[PDB]
């Protein structure tokens, strides 16, 4: 494709602006928040704390307007190179009418996070055409204790700071965990589980990658903030800390919307703490029942989700997925 | 095309499009059947009755087959879900919409069954009914079951002249007791419908369970919301964070630029996350002072008793004076 506007690569010493578009984690998990800030500051970055840092409004950090103001102040700040959510929740989609998309277009930045922040990552991409990044959120990702934080950090740097020739291979982490331990304070080492990606349905696909947190997508679907899925796209989806009933509903939502008629392939994230409801079924098994007799190449248990460690994935650029050989390559530039 | 009114001596077919309640809550199930049998309706038990597949009654295919057998049965005049859950939307590609259109019947239920009520209406243009599901609604103990049943007759069985006035119950309950077995009387909560934003509106009513709508939005099974429609929405047993997301989902989809009025159901067991905010207040924040007539705490949701509401027909609402009238025929 033609060259297009892209955000500048991260540099050592850059300022990362943090915001809380949903849950008030900087108030309710202060130890993990301070540890995450300290992790990035020790690496040499600066943190600009958004205006709702340390505030509390129960399930959220502040009103819809206050949250949009917090993010906009970062978007408008020429000194901020990267805008990172603190954590998700459920309420990022409330901000969408109020975001200064023109200011973001004027001065594109690296916009990164995951989970509920998908509303914003996809909304900015839909409105501006600037790739956004499914990747670390400050508290969950950078407040993780060693060792996994260091793997997350390495992938973050490799994708956002280092020069990469194309095609850029996204390597499989060697070890992983989803254990529900060590949130504020560490009580034992997480298990270093040997990692694998899963060749659910063989084949290859090449196309623009679209997606993120599937549950969250259902809060933006049909609006101007959801990029339209096009023939040949590769669908990236993950859910975390849900159950079999919920994810069947979301998979059937995609099916009845025709999404599976369009896409060339599917990348499915690991599903942190999945509740199978007694079925013993894996998330991909439920998805494949919904697919019925339609064969689609599918690579599952991809490490770009709430499990540790986490890959940083550009969204809105061409990718090659090889479900048979379990490879993912980025084929188009995502930063300058 | 309209369905025929229910009559005493008719057969109600029951199906389980999601949770396997006929297996998991057998006392309430049996009570519900017995209530309707004594009133004078036969019950035809769908093919998944008594089956168990964990969070669901059976496979996608088996659930579609269960419902289709009822659609295709000329002896059935009313098709009623047993209960909701999460997974009715899985059936939508597989339903025999043409058989339904060719021989319309009363389709009733609530909650997750919204996917099917709206899908049937979208595909066939035949009104469907937001109203009782067998086990939650008719397995309720006295007193509230009796009022739900009165409402059910008023919409489905009685010869009703237009306009059809939908009247507020005197008392309600959302109390989390007396599911399988009765232990105490439910407290009688005095009722009020709430004039949140004054005004009047007349238009086609569209909606149901809001959480469930997000599982069918954008598909051929979601009827297009049109300028002037009245939006009927409820959520049940959720929290402030969930409903903010759902209200904002409507907002960014332009729904509030189209609709002439909103009817908001009560919110059973609402978890306000410590905020002391009501559901309507969260909707008001989302609306940002856009003046849309809004009548809240409407009794067509998971609270008891329940109104049976036609969907897809013209309605007149007065939020100020707390009235709802159905203006267009919904049955023969
Ligand atoms: C905070 C909000 N309810 C939430 O779950 N946000 S989130 O989905 O973005 O959280 C990301 C991940 O952080 C972790 N997490 C969030 N809050 C947690 C807590 N209080 N304790 C343990 N893990 C938590 C889980 O891995 C979760 O999937
Ligand atoms: C069964 C499925 N998880 C569910 O909640 N289905 S439903 O949303 O349609 O349920 C309708 C209503 O039945 C009631 N309910 C369902 N299962 C129940 C149970 N096991 N105990 C108490 N009430 C229940 C609640 O009023 C609920 O809002």
The C-alpha angle with vertex A149 and arms to A138 and A151, in degrees rounded to 5, equals 120
CB-based burial label for B69 (10 Å; 0-12, 13-18, 19+): middle
Name the residue ranges covered by the structural domains of chain B: 1-163, 164-332
Fold that domain B164-332 belongs to in CATH: Glucose Oxidase; domain 1 (3.50.30)
Query: Is the CB of B89 less than 8 angstroms away from the CB of A252?
Result: yes
Q: Which residues contact B228 (CB under 8 A, 6 or more apart)?
A: B201, B203, B204, B258, B259, B260
Query: Is the CB of B248 less than 8 angstroms away from the CB of A292?
Result: no
Query: Whole-angstrom Cα distance, residue B270 to residue B292?
Result: 23
CB-based burial label for B181 (10 Å; 0-12, 13-18, 19+): exposed
Query: Whole-angstrom Cα distance, residue B106 to residue B128?
Result: 7
Query: Is the CB of B220 less than 8 angstroms away from the CB of A256?
Result: yes
Nearest-by-Cβ selection for B253 from A64, A223, A250: A223
A1-167 against A168-336: fold identical: no
Nearest-by-Cβ selection for B217 from A222, A243, A289: A222
The C-alpha angle with vertex B297 and arms to B291 and B301, in degrees rounded to 5, equals 120
**Taking the C-alpha atoms of B219, B313, B268 and B157 in order, what is their torsion angle to the nearest 10 degrees?**
-120
Query: Whole-angstrom Cα distance, residue B309 to residue B208?
Result: 10
Query: Whole-angstrom Cα distance, residue B95 to residue B67?
Result: 8
Report the residue among B15, B27, B136 best suited for mutation to probe ligand 2: largest number of ligand atoms under 8 A from its CB: B136
Instruction: Supply B35's token pair.
Output: 């209530």
**What does this entry list as its resolution, in Å?**
1.3
Our CA-based measurement puts residue A333 at a distance from the nearest CA of chain B, in whole angstroms, of 31
The residue of chain A nearest to residue B245, with distances taken between CA atoms, is A91
Q: How far is CA B251 from CA B4, B8, B243, in A?
A: 37, 44, 12
The C-alpha angle with vertex A190 and arms to A185 and A196, in degrees rounded to 5, equals 140
Report the residue among B16, B54, B83, B183 best suited for mutation to probe ligand 2: largest number of ligand atoms under 8 A from its CB: B83
Is residue B77 helix, strand or coil? strand
Residue-level length of chain A: 336
What is the rounded radius of gyration, in angstroms, for the C-alpha atoms of chain A?
A: 19
Query: Whole-angstrom Cα distance, residue B270 to residue B235?
Result: 9
Report the residue among A22, A23, A84, A148 best suited for mutation to probe ligand 1: largest number of ligand atoms under 8 A from its CB: A23
Report the greatest alpha carbon distance in chain A.
52
Instruction: Supply B142's token pair.
Output: 């006295």
The method recorded for this entry reads X-ray
Query: Is the CB of B90 less than 8 angstroms away from the CB of A290?
Result: yes
The C-alpha angle with vertex A307 and arms to A304 and A310, in degrees rounded to 5, equals 40
Domain boundaries B1-163, corresponding CATH code: 3.40.50.10740
Query: Is the CB of B244 less than 8 angstroms away from the CB of A58?
Result: no
In A138-167, the residues whose Cβ lies within 8 Å of chain B are: none
**Taking the C-alpha atoms of B85, B87, B88 and B92 in order, what is their torsion angle to the nearest 10 degrees?**
170
If we measure between CA atoms, which residue out of B233, B301, B219 comes closest to residue B262?
B233
If we measure between CA atoms, which residue out of A288, A220, A157 comes closest to residue B254?
A220
The C-alpha angle with vertex B77 and arms to B305 and B32, in degrees rounded to 5, equals 40
Query: Whole-angstrom Cα distance, residue A157 to residue A142?
Result: 13
**B105-116 as b/e: b if 16+ CB within 10 A:** bbbbbbbbbbbb
One DSSP character per residue, A215-273 reads HHHTTTTTSTTSPPP-TTPEEEEE--S-BHHHHHHHHHHHHHTTHHHH-SEEEEE--TT
- Cβ A36 under 6 angstroms from ligand 1: no
Domain A1-167: which CATH class? alpha beta
Size of interface A-B (CB pairs under 8 A): 120
Q: Which residues contact A185 (CB under 8 A, 6 or more apart)?
A: A31
DSSP lists the bridge partners of residue B134 as none
If we measure between CA atoms, which residue out of B249, B281, B86 comes closest to residue A91?
B249
Query: Whole-angstrom Cα distance, residue B75 to residue B7?
Result: 12
**A133-160 as b/e: b if 16+ CB within 10 A:** bbbbbbbbbbbbbeebbebbbebbebbb
- Cβ A182 under 6 angstroms from ligand 1: no
What backbone torsions phi and psi does residue A124 show, to the nearest 5 degrees? -65, -45
CB-based contact A4:A334 (threshold 8 Å): no
Nearest-by-Cβ selection for B219 from A93, A223, A256: A256
- Cβ A117 under 6 angstroms from ligand 1: no
Residue A316 has, within 13 A of its CA and on its CB side, a CA count of 24
In A58-87, the residues whose Cβ lies within 8 Å of chain B are: 58-60, 63-64
B219 shares contact with chain A (CB less than 8 Å): yes
If we measure between CA atoms, which residue out of A262, A213, A265 comes closest to residue A237?
A213
Nearest-by-Cβ selection for A58 from B245, B246, B275: B275
A32 shares contact with chain B (CB less than 8 Å): no
DSSP lists the bridge partners of residue B56 as B53
Q: How many CB atoms lie within 10 A of CB B224?
A: 8
Four-way CATH pick for A168-336: 3.50.30.30, 3.50.30.60, 1.20.1090.10, 3.40.640.10: 3.50.30.60
């Amino acid at each position: 494709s033609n060259a297009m506007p892209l955000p500048k690569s991260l540099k050592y010493g850059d300022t990362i602006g943090i915001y809380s578009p949903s849950s008030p984690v900087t108030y309710t998990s202060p130890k993990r928040f301070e540890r995450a800030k300290s992790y990035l500051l020790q690496k040499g970055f600066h943190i600009l704390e958004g205006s709702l840092t340390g505030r509390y409004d129960y399930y959220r950090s502040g009103s819809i307007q206050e949250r949009a103001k917090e993010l906009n102040a970062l978007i408008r700040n020429p000194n901020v190179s990267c805008i990172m959510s603190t954590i998700g929740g459920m309420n990022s989609n409330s901000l969408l009418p109020y975001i200064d998309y023109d200011a973001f277009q004027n001065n594109p930045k690296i916009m990164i996070g995951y989970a509920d922040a998908t509303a914003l990552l996809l909304g900015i991409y839909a409105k501006t055409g600037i790739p956004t990044f499914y990747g670390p959120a400050l508290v969950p990702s950078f407040g993780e204790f060693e060792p996994f934080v260091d793997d997350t950090y390495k992938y973050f740097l490799e994708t956002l700071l280092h020069d990469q020739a194309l095609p850029y291979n996204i390597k499989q982490p060697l070890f992983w965990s989803d254990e529900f331990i060590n949130w504020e304070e560490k009580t034992k080492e997480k298990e270093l589980r040997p990692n694998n990606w899963i060749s659910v349905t063989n084949g290859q696909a090449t196309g623009r990658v679209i997606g993120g947190n599937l549950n969250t997508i259902q809060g933006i679907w049909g609006s101007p903030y959801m990029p339209c899925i096009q023939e040949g796209d590769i669908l990236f989806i993950e859910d975390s800390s849900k159950d079999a009933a919920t994810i069947e509903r979301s998979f059937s939502f995609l099916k009845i919307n025709g999404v599976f008629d369009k896409v060339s392939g599917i990348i499915l994230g690991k599903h942190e703490q999945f509740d199978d409801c007694g079925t013993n079924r894996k998330p991909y098994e439920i998805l494949l029942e919904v697919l019925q007799n339609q064969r689609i190449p599918l690579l599952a248990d991809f490490d770009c989700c709430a499990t540790h460690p986490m890959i940083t994935m550009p969204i809105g650029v061409q990718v090659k997925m090889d479900a048979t050989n379990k490879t993912i390559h980025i084929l188009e530039k995502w930063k300058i």
